[PDB]
Amino acid sequence: DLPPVAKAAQVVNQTLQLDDSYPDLDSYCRPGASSDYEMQSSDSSWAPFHVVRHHNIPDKVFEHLNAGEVFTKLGLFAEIGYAWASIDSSLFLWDYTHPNPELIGYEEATHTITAVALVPPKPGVFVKTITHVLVVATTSEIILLGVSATPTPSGSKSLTLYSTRMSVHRGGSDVSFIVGTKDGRIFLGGESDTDIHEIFYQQEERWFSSRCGKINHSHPFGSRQQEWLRGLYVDDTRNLLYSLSNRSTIRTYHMEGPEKLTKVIEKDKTSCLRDFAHMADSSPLFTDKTNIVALSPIPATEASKLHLMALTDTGCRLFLSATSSASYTALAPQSMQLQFVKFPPRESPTRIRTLSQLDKTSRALDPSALGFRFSPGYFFDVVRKHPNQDMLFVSAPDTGRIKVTQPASALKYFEQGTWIELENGNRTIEIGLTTAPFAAAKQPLGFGNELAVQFDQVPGEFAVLTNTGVHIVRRRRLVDIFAKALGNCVSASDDALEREVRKFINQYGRVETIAAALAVACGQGSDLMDRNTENLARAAFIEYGGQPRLASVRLSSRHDALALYLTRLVRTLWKAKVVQVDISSTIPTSKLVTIQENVERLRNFLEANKSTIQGLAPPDIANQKEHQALHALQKLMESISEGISFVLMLFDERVSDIYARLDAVSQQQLKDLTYEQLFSQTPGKELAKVLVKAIVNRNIASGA
Amino acid sequence: LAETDFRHAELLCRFYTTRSRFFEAAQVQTNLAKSDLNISLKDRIILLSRAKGNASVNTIGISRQQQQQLNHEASELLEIAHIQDDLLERLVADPRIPEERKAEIEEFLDGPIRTLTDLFNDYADQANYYDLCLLIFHAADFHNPRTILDTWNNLINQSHFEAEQRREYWPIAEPPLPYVYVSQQIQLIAHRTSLDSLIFPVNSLLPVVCAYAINNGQDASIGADPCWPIQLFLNLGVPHALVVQVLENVLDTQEAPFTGRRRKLVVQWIAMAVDMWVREVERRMGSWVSELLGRADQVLTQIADAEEIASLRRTVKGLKRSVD
């Protein structure tokens, strides 16, 4: 009744939903606490992160820095691969990915520079080629410069600066923190007080208004005690702005309009401590003596309730929710509460490899000087136990264990952690993300599924700026760990592989492990011996893939692994529309090519092992449906490749021309045609047969 | 008494080791693991692990050759016993296997150490345990470039599937993206293999992982580091000079999937690899690398993301200066 490709498409749809059901942050960080860690040595194949390269500060910057009379400062523009150094009233930028960079000098400023930041531009203000705005704050004024960071053939942005005539006198309040919103709004704060200012600017000059203005959103008056800021933090997904004070007070501001900023929550350390005391597990790691050293916003795409992470100097991660009083009039929250605490790990870093209650007393992260969190939870902590050498604790969610955990009430914030040592003299200054922000889905459920996006987006990389250089740290995927582990089994027994494989099964489950073997066998992770590793991966896919059984049948883990891998290769395509109507393609052509190559390499792998892989060759009811299921998947693969080739052919011509000379029903059918329908449903095939019959007609008119 | 009582052979081994007759102890520990005595497999793993240590250091009177002659024998068996243990552990927990057979296996495996032939055929290969199949090839010095590579391909695919099914289900915690679990299954072999050239041939495996990273779309689309295949092999201990030697071979042949505008990603890999190479030399290569980076630039113009390419060309031309 139902043909092969339609049967396999059913498996894809159900697999997509399974990946998009990955637990949301609120679900495994429920009210309570956790100390769950599995620590890995930094030199281990199971390390969750590792250093890939380093970039020294240019010698000319050292000449200027040691030529500093009063004040110097370093910072990162990780989004574009640039770093900067300010010396008194002079500023120097450079591309740290370049082996011998030239210094972009800017010395117009008259007074000491106190802060520098790179923010998005205000729309409809600048020429489209201006990609960013450079904000330079001195003790006398704030200066805006246009920036164009266009990519180069080498892979590092070319940076050119533009004057703007946009500037405003600073005033009496120091500026040490500058943050920008998605829409180009610029907010300022510093070490004089807790006030937050905003810089406005517009293209047109008016007789009653200047091109650039500044206002204090805090409207202070009367008696005020000493208190200033330690940082500013933006969350565009909620239109919120957070400030952290030197007294560890957390203030939340809501952008109720394009020019408004309203304080809506103020939560001092006493309030946090009161919440903490009402929790089941209180700890001497968090007292009235403890300082909060950093905040990290959590976007609404990642979690609904948990808005914010706060890091103590003892290494405790405080996760705070925020809630509005009502459900309708963005809606501003009015309350903030400490709900969940992740306590520090216990293992300390060691030169030599050392050998179930809540651990709420570890000092391993004491003192924590700097801290950063990146979605879906990558955590960097600069531990400064000694005044000369920083130690870097880096952890990630145990995505594999979180995904397999059952039932939902057993979910905990499992983590994989490691210690990265920096050499003597390296003082960490800043850590920034160099790759695109992580997101496996568009809502909390499914958002944190690292496994699903292993082959759709490069692993996250992070630039660690120190006083001596920039270190690149890269997140390692399951396939990276699996390939590395197998690389150590090349010179060992049949039982050596089985032992290493069992480690993966106990953490990730059998399907995820066999899917990793399939991926490695197909060359994934090789963008980083390699024939033997891929042959070992093939051996693991065959030997440990399981078999089909009567419970309606239960297909082998080898089959589910093939379906899982294939689904993840096309997850960005399946439910997407093929075209966007001047008609264009929803998916960039370059992305369609890589997807097709991946599908074809998978097909090539199955053909070259049709004789050795169980189920491919024809074979009692169990092995029968195993053969039918595997056959249907392979028919979907070739259909996927044909479908992609058809779309590429289509846009090589002039589709808008073809679309014009077309009937309405076929324009409408093409309007809402998905890749799933093209791959697995007759109407996509019938429509494809119409389009080919139409493109050739047009091709004859061009007559090439 | 050691001949018929395991716990008395224990003292004789302790007797020798307090007197510092280390070889004589490993001589008994090894000869005891190979015995016909009722000893669990996990104990025989301890015996061979102690024997490997006691036979690693010089002992007064005994040769260097007879010392290594025993260390090599013990090390071999330990590698096999570890496979056999990790195999049994997985077979017993395998839902695909009947509970009647699992008991028949456990009696056979949970004791003396069997031949790799027995471990491979009647168990490892049938269950499609591709990772443990590779460990057997390594432990058996199995010379065959194809089957080693075919097994790697199956291991990668089966791993990708298990991870994509998990991500689709989310499953207690957020599972990892596919390439992450695939990366784990290679690291597990890499440390365990000790990076033998036969079962870990970068000449072929790295293209496979890089191919998998394309054919299965493990890239920026899902938030992954596009250069995660390079980052994997470098951090695993592969020489920089070799990785760039392979990417060179990939960029010229242009065998699929490394064709068309997807070669934009090949250059990104080359930039990452070479960049990590000069940064590793300046922290502490010839004309052919400069020949490549310049040739890699033709690719970016031949492909001319309009700003990504432009920014990438200026990262390549930066490395060409750093080498010349």
Partner: peptide
């Protein structure tokens, strides 16, 4: 010493006798 022999094995997925 390894010798692959896919020919005659024992069905890992069937009980004995």
């Amino acid at each position: 010493k390894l010798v692959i022999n896919k020919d005659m094995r024992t069905d890992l997925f069937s009980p004995p006798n």
